[PDB]
RNA sequence: CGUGAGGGAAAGGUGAAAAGAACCCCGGGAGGGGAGUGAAAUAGAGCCUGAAACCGUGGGCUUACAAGCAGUCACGGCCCC
RNA sequence: GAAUGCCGGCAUGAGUAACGAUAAAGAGGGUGAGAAUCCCUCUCGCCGUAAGCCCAAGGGUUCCUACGCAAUGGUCGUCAG
RNA sequence: CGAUGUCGGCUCGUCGCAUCCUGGGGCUGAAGAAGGUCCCAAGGGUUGGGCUGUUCGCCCAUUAAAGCGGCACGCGAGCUGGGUUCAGAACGUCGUGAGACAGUUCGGUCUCUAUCCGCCACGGGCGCAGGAGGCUUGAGGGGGGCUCUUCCUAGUACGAGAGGACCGGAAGGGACGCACCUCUGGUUUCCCAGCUGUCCCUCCAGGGGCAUAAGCUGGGUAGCCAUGUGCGGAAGGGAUAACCGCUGAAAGCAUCUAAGCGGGAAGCCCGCCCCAAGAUGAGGCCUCCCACGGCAGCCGGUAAGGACCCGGGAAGACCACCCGGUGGAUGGGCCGGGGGUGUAAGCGCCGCGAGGCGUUGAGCCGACCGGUCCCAAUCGUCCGAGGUCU
């Protein structure tokens, strides 16, 4: 039974998961676009939105915050300067997840872009 | 033999006399009658009631000519009490008061597959004292050579919940018809949001 | 255990039978609005990289 | 339909405001009704509340006092019919929610433990000038 | 929830300091004990020259439990002890003074004479 | 294979002649399709003949209310000569 | 036609168990017919009285470079003992 | 004997009835209450513990009762491995001896993969003469079936007295079953906070990794849960068992019987709950489509519908089931509420300092209850009647 439980294990543990989701989360604000396998694609939307609403409130409190999960304080001026004023008017849906149409070769993994939304 | 169709909505507890009483409630009106089942046409009594509106557009030209038929707007759910005949052509919570006493039927929860242990309470085994991987087994399921086989309806494990079951002689707390509300005493089958059916208590 | 083991070799007919369920279904695939291409549904078009009507790929 | 409003619809009939407010670690008075023979009596159970369960109506609050010798905890509805009234005896400052440690502590600990709470005294005090 | 095993405090002055349940006496198969039910025990402690001696069998009723007990109007108390009155077959007490509060539960049960020697009634 | 003494296999055949398939075509290659050699190429080198088990493609009859050492005797249906 | 016969071939079990330490991965760029698996970069994790370094046995070209990918590699392979 | 693993326990049952209890009876040396003895009866039930490998048995505390047997002394491709029954060692004993006894004593390898039948679950196919979407009848199955205490009747009948009813009527329990999560109590692998050591970012401050597959610690929502909550056993009707009668011959009397008719069990049939038309005997009702081209048959494009694909789901191993797909609140984000944590950072002030105070119930913040088209369910495709005969 999982009835009403939220979030993939993605069979990695508990530390691992997060360092998955802060990776890509690095690797997307930094490409502004990546390739993934569909359910980690899906589960990176929540993640890194987050962090993105978190620069649009701007203070130093929330860079702070999201330094927490992406470390890098150059990146964290990237997003902050560059990437959240775009978004100062959405009101969530910062990214978008995308399907490709060919799996993977050597294991079959369907595969989706991640992108932040214009 | 009075019956309605309803959605299990959550559980609280009110406070009657001085006791705590847990209540489950349930939103069950309004249910407009679509169709009546009678011992000419249909060999036996009952009455097909319906409930929650349905967006027009998902509803499919078979279901919308039965619905017409009955002069009656499209609905998410089609059931019958059985040996019931409402006087109106629509049965609300009103055909119950307080103090009456209720059967209810819902589709109870589903644990997916399911162990000896959970589904029939089996001991399972030791977890100490040598046990080999067998401490949620069921142990023996027979004899020998006779009867070299296994009885039908051994308990295994399977399947267990997601099924219909009834909780009879429900008390009625209270009917709150201005929101279609029933509240009634003690616990009902299936999750909240659920589809139950509220009838008339079948003990005396 | 006491390590189970085939009774009886399993016929041509049997084990041909458990295999009547093993055919594959071939890929589902819509036309392209764009390119008319043969792809998946639900997919980014990956003979022209358009979806929903726009360009979002280099192919 | 909104099954949470239909549940605190249900609720609304029996929720209470007229109780004060209080924290884990406050001292209080409930006065409490009670049913014995033949009669019904308010009887009080003033201690330390070591918690308190949040779930809107469905709240409830633990208060523990010793009673000669022995430890007793009480589980009160917060919003129960049967509390007359809760008074605020002292206002303790604690660093949790839940006061479970207490339960293992001398007198003379909890007194450390627990100092008075003066920003919620003094507060206490300002209102309780009454116009 | 007392069951067989369980030391209890006995919140008498019988002289028994600790006993240990072995039966609950309430129906052919009864797990466990709470407040207001008999029991049979062992007396496992006692100070000296008490009406009741290590090692006698007796009966008690429980007055207090570390299980919280729930009542119908959705309060509940809890103790921080297990503890009995050792008693007779007539239900009454066999000593003469009890100690530390009682559950009030033992009024409705019939345990009147051990309510009322009580210093506290919860 | 065995430290060692010692143990101890499997594996023959294109064609008369290499005339052992230039060149083109799909393919990264393998492999194949043409062309070409040959009396013969399911003699094309994984090569004489090429059984049987075993695997597959196509066709005829037949099969989803049935109880079986699988056949046999009878009759009827369908297909073929 | 049987010798739990001998040699060889091929079935069944079965697309099943398993793919050899639960130290752990992610993305971008490149190469290429083909890339989860090769190279490069960033991020993450693991060892650190070693899972690092040096020597002796033993092994015997496995070293370096270029060109390769049929087989070997428990997958893949453009990589490699 | 080219192997049918042998005691005991555990687990899981199921059956017999020569019945331990509960239900119904007759007789009694049956006043009552309690028993004795036999008859009917297998629906349900038949406790926990000390000893010992034990089965058994004795004992302790209860109980309505603590039944006896069968199923390869049921069950080791289900577990155990204490007994016994390989190799070691020792005692008693026997034997000159090597060794021996079942006599005793300590120790001593219990095999990942289920093919067929069987069993528990779940699908795929075809069928149910047109093709469809719903709603159903219930043939036939399964489940369940226990029981105690107190009180009133009434301290009455009965009895010298102790004691103490039938029948009828209340209330409360034990164990068991099904469901549930409001309360109580768990868990809650990252929801919050505190803490140590080290390394790092960026020196301070503030943080991150690691110490477990949570470093440790204090808490903890939803969900899943029991220790928690609701509810169930019935009632009622029918036919019976033993047994009791009515009327009544054969047999002028008598006889429950030969004709006929009453009464009468926790047991039997039904009633309750669940499955169920592959019930091929393939049932019924409501509604939808239509007489389409070419050649009870074939090809083709359709209709009503359906599938595929996608977003998902207290549904779930896959499959199925159920919801939703821009005509949209399906998931994700965002917003509000709930909920947990328990007063963030930064700044100011007090202190030599560790710290403290204020801003501030602050900040953070999974799942719960909702709102909102910001992100994504784009766009589409393929199936699918023309209704045999009397
Ligand atoms: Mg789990
Ligand atoms: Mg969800
Ligand atoms: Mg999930
Ligand atoms: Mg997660
Ligand atoms: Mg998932
Ligand atoms: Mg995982
Ligand atoms: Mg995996
Ligand atoms: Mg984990
Ligand atoms: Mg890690
Ligand atoms: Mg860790
Ligand atoms: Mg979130
Ligand atoms: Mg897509
Ligand atoms: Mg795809
Ligand atoms: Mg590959
Ligand atoms: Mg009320
Ligand atoms: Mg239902
Ligand atoms: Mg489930
Ligand atoms: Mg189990
Ligand atoms: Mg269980
Ligand atoms: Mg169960
Ligand atoms: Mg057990
Ligand atoms: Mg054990
Ligand atoms: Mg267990
Ligand atoms: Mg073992
Ligand atoms: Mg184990
Ligand atoms: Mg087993
Ligand atoms: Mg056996
Ligand atoms: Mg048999
Ligand atoms: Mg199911
Ligand atoms: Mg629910
Ligand atoms: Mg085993
Ligand atoms: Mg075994
Ligand atoms: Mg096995
Ligand atoms: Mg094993
Ligand atoms: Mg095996
Ligand atoms: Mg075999
Ligand atoms: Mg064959
Ligand atoms: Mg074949
Ligand atoms: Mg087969
Ligand atoms: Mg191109
Ligand atoms: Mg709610
Ligand atoms: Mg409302
Ligand atoms: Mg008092
Ligand atoms: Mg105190
Ligand atoms: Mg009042
Ligand atoms: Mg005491
Ligand atoms: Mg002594
Ligand atoms: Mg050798
Ligand atoms: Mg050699
Ligand atoms: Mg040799
Ligand atoms: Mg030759
Ligand atoms: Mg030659
Ligand atoms: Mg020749
Ligand atoms: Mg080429
Ligand atoms: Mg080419
Ligand atoms: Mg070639
Ligand atoms: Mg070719
Ligand atoms: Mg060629
Ligand atoms: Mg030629
Ligand atoms: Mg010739
Ligand atoms: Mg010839
Ligand atoms: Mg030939
Ligand atoms: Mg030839
Ligand atoms: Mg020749
Ligand atoms: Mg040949
Ligand atoms: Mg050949
Ligand atoms: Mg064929
Ligand atoms: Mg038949
Ligand atoms: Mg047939
Ligand atoms: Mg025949
Ligand atoms: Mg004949
Ligand atoms: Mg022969
Ligand atoms: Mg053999
Ligand atoms: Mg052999
Ligand atoms: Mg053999
Ligand atoms: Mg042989
Ligand atoms: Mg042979
Ligand atoms: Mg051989
Ligand atoms: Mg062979
Ligand atoms: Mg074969
Ligand atoms: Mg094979
Ligand atoms: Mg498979
Ligand atoms: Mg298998
Ligand atoms: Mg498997
Ligand atoms: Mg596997
Ligand atoms: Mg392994
Ligand atoms: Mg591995
Ligand atoms: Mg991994
Ligand atoms: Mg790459
Ligand atoms: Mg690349
Ligand atoms: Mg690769
Ligand atoms: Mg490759
Ligand atoms: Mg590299
Ligand atoms: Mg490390
Ligand atoms: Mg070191
Ligand atoms: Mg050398
Ligand atoms: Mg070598
Ligand atoms: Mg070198
Ligand atoms: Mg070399
Ligand atoms: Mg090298
Ligand atoms: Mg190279
Ligand atoms: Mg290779
Ligand atoms: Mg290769
Ligand atoms: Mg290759
Ligand atoms: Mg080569
Ligand atoms: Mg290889
Ligand atoms: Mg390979
Ligand atoms: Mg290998
Ligand atoms: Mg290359
Ligand atoms: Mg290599
Ligand atoms: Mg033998
Ligand atoms: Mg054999
Ligand atoms: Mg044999
Ligand atoms: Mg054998
Ligand atoms: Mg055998
Ligand atoms: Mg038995
Ligand atoms: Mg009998
Ligand atoms: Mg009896
Ligand atoms: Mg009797
Ligand atoms: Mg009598
Ligand atoms: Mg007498
Ligand atoms: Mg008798
Ligand atoms: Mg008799
Ligand atoms: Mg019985
Ligand atoms: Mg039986
Ligand atoms: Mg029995
Ligand atoms: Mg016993
Ligand atoms: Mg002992
Ligand atoms: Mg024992
Ligand atoms: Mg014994
Ligand atoms: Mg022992
Ligand atoms: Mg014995
Ligand atoms: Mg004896
Ligand atoms: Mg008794
Ligand atoms: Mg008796
Ligand atoms: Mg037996
Ligand atoms: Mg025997
Ligand atoms: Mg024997
Ligand atoms: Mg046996
Ligand atoms: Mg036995
Ligand atoms: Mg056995
Ligand atoms: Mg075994
Ligand atoms: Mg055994
Ligand atoms: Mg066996
Ligand atoms: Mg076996
Ligand atoms: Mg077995
Ligand atoms: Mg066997
Ligand atoms: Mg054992
Ligand atoms: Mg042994
Ligand atoms: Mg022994
Ligand atoms: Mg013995
Ligand atoms: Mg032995
Ligand atoms: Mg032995
Ligand atoms: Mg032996
Ligand atoms: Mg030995
Ligand atoms: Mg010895
Ligand atoms: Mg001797
Ligand atoms: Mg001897
Ligand atoms: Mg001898
Ligand atoms: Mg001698
Ligand atoms: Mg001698
Ligand atoms: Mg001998
Ligand atoms: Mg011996
Ligand atoms: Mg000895
Ligand atoms: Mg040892
Ligand atoms: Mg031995
Ligand atoms: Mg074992
Ligand atoms: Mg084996
Ligand atoms: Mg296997
Ligand atoms: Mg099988
Ligand atoms: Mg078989
Ligand atoms: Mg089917
Ligand atoms: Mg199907
Ligand atoms: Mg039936
Ligand atoms: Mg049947
Ligand atoms: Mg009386
Ligand atoms: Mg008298
Ligand atoms: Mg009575
Ligand atoms: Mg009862
Ligand atoms: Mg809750
Ligand atoms: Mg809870
Ligand atoms: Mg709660
Ligand atoms: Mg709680
Ligand atoms: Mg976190
Ligand atoms: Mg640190
Ligand atoms: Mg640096
Ligand atoms: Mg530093
Ligand atoms: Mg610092
Ligand atoms: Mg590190
Ligand atoms: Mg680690
Ligand atoms: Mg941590
Ligand atoms: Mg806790
Ligand atoms: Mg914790
Ligand atoms: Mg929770
Ligand atoms: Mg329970
Ligand atoms: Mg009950
Ligand atoms: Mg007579
Ligand atoms: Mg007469
Ligand atoms: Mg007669
Ligand atoms: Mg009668
Ligand atoms: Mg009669
Ligand atoms: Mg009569
Ligand atoms: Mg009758
Ligand atoms: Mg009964
Ligand atoms: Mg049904
Ligand atoms: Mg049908
Ligand atoms: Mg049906
Ligand atoms: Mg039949
Ligand atoms: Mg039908
Ligand atoms: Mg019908
Ligand atoms: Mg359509
Ligand atoms: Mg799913
Ligand atoms: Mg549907
Ligand atoms: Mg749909
Ligand atoms: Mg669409
Ligand atoms: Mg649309
Ligand atoms: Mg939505
Ligand atoms: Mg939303
Ligand atoms: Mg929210
Ligand atoms: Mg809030
Ligand atoms: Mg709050
Ligand atoms: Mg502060
Ligand atoms: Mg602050
Ligand atoms: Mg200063
Ligand atoms: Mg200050
Ligand atoms: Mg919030
Ligand atoms: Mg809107
Ligand atoms: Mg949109
Ligand atoms: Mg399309
Ligand atoms: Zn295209």
Redesign the pocket.
């Known amino acids: ?7 993939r ?1 993605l069979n ?9 989701y ?3 989360a ?3 604000l ?2 502004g ?6 359910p ?1 694609a ?2 990176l ?3 890194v ?6 620069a649009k ?1 701007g ?4 860079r ?2 999201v ?3 992406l ?3 150059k990146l964290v001026r990237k997003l902050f300067d560059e990437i959240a004023p775009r ?1 100062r008017d ?10 490709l149409a ?1 799996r ?8 989706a ?1 991640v992108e932040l ?2 | 033999m009075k019956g309605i169709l309803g959605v ?6 009110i406070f009657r006399d001085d006791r ?5 409630v349930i939103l069950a009106g309004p249910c407009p009658v ?2 009546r ?1 009678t011992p000419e ?4 009594t ?1 009455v ?2 319906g409930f929650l509106p ?5 509803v ?11 002069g009656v707007e499209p609905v ?7 040996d019931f005949n409402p006087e109106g052509d629509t049965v609300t919570v009103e055909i119950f008061k307080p103090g009456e ?1 209720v ?1 209810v ?10 162990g ?1 242990m ?9 977890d100490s ?6 401490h949620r ?35 009625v707390v209270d009917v709150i018809p201005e929101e279609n509300l029933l509240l ?11 589809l139950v059916i509220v ?1 008339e ?4 | ?12 007919a ?3 039978a ?5 055919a594959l ?1 071939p ?7 764009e390119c008319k291409a043969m ?5 980014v ?1 990956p003979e022209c990289g ?4 726009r360009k979002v790929l280099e192919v | ?8 619809l249900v609720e609304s009939r029996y929720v209470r405001t007229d109780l004060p407010e209080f ?3 406050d001292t209080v008075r409930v006065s409490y009704k009670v049913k014995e023979g033949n009669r019904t009596r308010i009887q009080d159970f003033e201690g330390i509340v070591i ?12 208060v523990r006092k010793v009673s000669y010798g022995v430890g007793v ?1 009480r ?1 009160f ?1 917060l919003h129960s019919p049967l509390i007359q009234k809760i008074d605020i005896v002292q206002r303790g ?9 207490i339960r293992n502590l001398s007198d003379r600990e909890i007194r450390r433990k627990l100092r008075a ?4 005294i003094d ?1 206490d005090r300002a209102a309780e000038r009454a116009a | ?1 007392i ?3 369980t030391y209890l405090e006995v919140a008498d002055n019988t002289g028994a300091r600790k006993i240990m349940c ?11 004990a ?1 407040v207001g039910d008999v029991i ?1 025990a ?1 007396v496992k402690e006692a100070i000296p020259r008490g009406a009741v001696k290590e090692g006698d ?1 007796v ?1 008690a009723v429980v007055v207090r439990t570390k ?4 009542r ?1 109007d ?3 108390i ?1 103790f921080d002890d297990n503890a009995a009155v050792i008693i007779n077959n007539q239900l009454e007490p066999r000593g003469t003074r009890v100690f530390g509060p009682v559950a009030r539960e033992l009024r409705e049960k019939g345990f009147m004479k051990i309510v009322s020697l009580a210093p506290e009634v919860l």
């Open positions: 039974m999982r009835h009403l439980k939220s979030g294990k990695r543990h508990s530390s691992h998961r997060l360092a998955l802060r990776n890509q690095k690797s997307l930094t490409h676009r990546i390739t993934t396998t569909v980690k899906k589960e939307r929540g993640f939105d987050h962090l993105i609403h978190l409130r203070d130093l409190h929330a702070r915050l330094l927490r999960d470390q890098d304080v978004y959405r009101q969530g849906g910062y990214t978008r997840v995308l399907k060919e993977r070769r050597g294991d079959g993994a369907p595969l872009l939304v214009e | 299990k909505v959550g559980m609280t507890r705590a009483v847990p209540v489950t679509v169709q089942r046409k249909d060999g036996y009952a097909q009631l349905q967006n027009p557009k998902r499919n030209r078979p279901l919308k000519g039965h619905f017409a038929k009955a998410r759910i089609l059931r019958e009490i059985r006493r059967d039927t819902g589709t109870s929860k589903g644990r997916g597959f399911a000896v959970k589904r029939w309470n089996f001991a399972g085994g030791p004292h040598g046990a080999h991987k067998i087994h069921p142990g023996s399921i027979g004899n020998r050579k006779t009867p070299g086989r296994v009885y039908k309806g051994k308990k295994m494990a399977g399947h267990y919940g997601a099924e219909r079951v009834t909780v009879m002689n429900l008390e009634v005493k003690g616990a009902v089958p299936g999750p909240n949001g659920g009838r208590t079948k003990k005396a | 255990a006491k390590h189970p083991v085939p009774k009886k070799k399993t016929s041509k049997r084990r041909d458990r295999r009547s369920h093993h279904t890929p589902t695939l819509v036309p392209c609005p792809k998946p549904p639900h997919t078009c358009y979806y929903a009507g | 339909m909104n099954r949470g409003a239909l549940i605190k924290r884990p670690g918690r308190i369960r949040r779930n809107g109506f469905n709240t409830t609050f633990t905890e589980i509805p400052r604690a660093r949790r929610a839940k006061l479970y440690f709470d003066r920003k919620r507060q | 929830m069951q067989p095993q072995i039966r609950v006496l309430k129906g052919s198969n009864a797990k466990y709470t049979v062992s069998v009966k299980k919280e007990i729930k119908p959705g309060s509940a809890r």
